[PDB]
């Protein structure tokens, strides 16, 4: 079967590249939507809050 697939161009490479691009772009979405400030602030002890 591996030999017989070799006569069909690069279908497998195309599919793998497409899926890898998909996998990259979701985590890019996450980094874009969440990480917008590069100073992790520390929660102050809640006492007053008006």
């Amino acid at each position: 079967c591996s030999n017989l697939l070799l006569q069909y161009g690069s279908f497998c490479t195309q599919l793998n590249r497409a899926l890898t691009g998909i996998a990259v772009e979701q985590d890019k979405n996450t980094q874009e939507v969440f990480a917008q400030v590069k100073q992790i602030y520390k929660t102050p002890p809640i006492k007053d809050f008006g």
Binding site: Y41, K42, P44
Partner: protein
């Protein structure tokens, strides 16, 4: 995630800027791709009548 930072919350203090800075940043947007066309019969059959 980034350098740690904390801010001294308190209900009788205010922190105000006293000097500014005019910065300039670049944003890059694609607009259009290469206007491609394809000849069906030529690419699928070359120059054969059959």
């Amino acid at each position: 995630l980034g350098a740690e930072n904390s801010v001294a919350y308190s209900n009788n203090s205010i922190a105000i800027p006293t000097n500014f800075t005019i910065s300039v940043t670049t944003e890059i947007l694609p607009v259009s791709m290469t206007k491609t066309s394809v000849d069906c019969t030529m690419y699928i059959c070359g120059d054969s009548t059959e």
